[PDB]
Amino acid sequence: RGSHMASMEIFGKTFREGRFVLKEKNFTVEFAVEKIHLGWKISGRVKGSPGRLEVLRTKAPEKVLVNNWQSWGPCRVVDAFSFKPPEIDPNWRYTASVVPDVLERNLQSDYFVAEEGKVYGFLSSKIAHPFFAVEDGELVAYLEYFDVEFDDFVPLEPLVVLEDPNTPLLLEKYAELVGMENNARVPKHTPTGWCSWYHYFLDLTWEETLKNLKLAKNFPFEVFQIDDAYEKDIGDWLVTRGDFPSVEEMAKVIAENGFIPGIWTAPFSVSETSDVFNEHPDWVVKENGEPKMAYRNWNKKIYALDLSKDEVLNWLFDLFSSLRKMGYRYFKIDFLFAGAVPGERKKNITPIQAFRKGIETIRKAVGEDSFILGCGSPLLPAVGCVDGMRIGPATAPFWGEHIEDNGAPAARWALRNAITRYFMHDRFWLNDPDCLILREEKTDLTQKEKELYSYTCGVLDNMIIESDDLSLVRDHGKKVLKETLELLGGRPRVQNIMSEDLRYEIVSSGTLSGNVKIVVDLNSREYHLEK
Ligand SMILES: OCC1=C[C@H](Oc2cc(F)cc(F)c2)[C@H](O)[C@@H](O)[C@H]1O
Ligand SMILES: [Mg+2]
Ligand SMILES: [Mg+2]
């Protein structure tokens, strides 16, 4: 018990243990408030038209760890009372929020929120989108059902409230419950590999690919992954451009060289210029009967597939079936937020319901022995489907000392999110902190900075992928990788998770180098490691 617990409300009514029933004009919910280890759990079921359903109300803390819904968005500590709404880029509206009306008035946090000594968190997002808002000094938890009606009962997304001095332990515990609730996939083996993006970007040639393929026999890579560059257009994934061969021919060549073939797609996205859009314009999410722009990128309007339509799911099954048959066993599936944009779909289901039919179709198509890696993705809804997940914005071959914490490529902000989302590793999935850039030339990263990034990711036990012209990686670059791989295998903890000054103390236990600690400063770019 406590004064602060007595101040809480659940579904409109002062907090206490028990079973309850709430009959309102347009919906009904039945819920239980049960005791669990380190606090409380609210669970139940709902029917009718719940709209934006208020679950919990409590006093807003002064400092809160907030979390954006998707890969690239910040997880960071923020002063709650001195919040001002950001201006929202109309090209990137839905990477900031799936409920942008909230963000333009109030501080928002998706899926969970933390303070010193306390965590509030939902265990799932299967039907509704669970978020928090700070409204006039109160913290308020909602489930958004996006105007769907339910004739029969469906389960609530469960909420837990946990209390203990050790906040790191609360987050690790929250994540364990999330893991159990969603049948998380956590492979016993972690892949190493190579990725084209962070050297060649959109200008990768097959000539350059063949060159790197040969050099990679001298590096400890299992996987060889082609990124954005090969494809004809966004949506036309089985047609290549430039000097590239067929998609089947690439897979066959990578395999012969002794590597697991990997390939990038953005599978819920189709451009205004693509073949598949012009063939099948009715396959996309709509506004007033017209195609609704999901985002703008590659200097084109990009639309979202309507994953409520059988035609669309059949098309996805056939695509990823074909890729599997060719020999691809590693799939980076990107810009997935597109699949969950609000709007008009064929069937009257939520965007989250549609997202989940989408990603389940992909897993079905590629099978169980394929490794899926999420990117640009809603986090909670993906748990149990993906094997790995990018948990930060894009890294870069420069620190970004003078770049703002929005979502623009920068090493500093990419590593920040790997630290503040550490607790998802080995519970939701394998965390992907984005690629190591270890080349000596064609870069602005200092040796110090390269050491900071790589050793931190090794301590955290995160996926280790390099992205370089392997010609430009010599003695220092090879040594940094070898040592980073030595740092894997432990159980990590960020001890000062609520810090506001970009300095962190991080421990890991049972690494291949025993027990270690690293102290890192992301502002000054300094580190201190003990083995
Ligand atoms: O377009 C390819 C691509 C896109 C994504 O990165 C960005 C996504 C953006 F919206 C803007 C940007 F400058 C970079 C992925 O995180 C990155 O890893 C790469 O695969
Ligand atoms: Mg009250
Ligand atoms: Mg591990």
Numbering used by the authors: -6 to 524
What did the original publication write about this model?
Of the GH mechanisms that catalyze glycosidic bond hydrolysis, most that occur with retention of stereochemistry rely on two active site aspartic acid (Asp) and/or glutamic acid (Glu) residues. As a result, we hypothesized that a galacto-configured analog would covalently label a GH36 α-galactosidase, a member of GH clan-D, that has as its main structural element a (β/α)8 fold, which is the same protein fold as found for family GH13. Here we present the synthesis of three cyclohexene-based mimics of galactose including a 2-deoxy-2-fluorogalactose analog and the kinetic characterization of their reactions with an α-galactosidase from Thermotoga maritima (TmGalA).
With the aim of delineating the conformational itinerary for intermediates along the reaction path, we undertook structural studies to observe enzyme-bound species during the covalent inhibition of TmGalA by carbasugar 3a. We note that the active site contains electron density consistent with a Michaelis complex of an intact molecule of 3a bound. The carbasugar moiety displays a 2H3 half chair conformation with key interactions between the C6-OH with Asp221; the C4-OH with Trp257, Asp220, and Lys325; and the C3-OH with Lys325, Arg383, and Tyr191. The C2-OH and the 3,5-difluorophenyl leaving group of 3a form no interactions with TmGalA, and 3a itself has no interactions with bound water molecules.
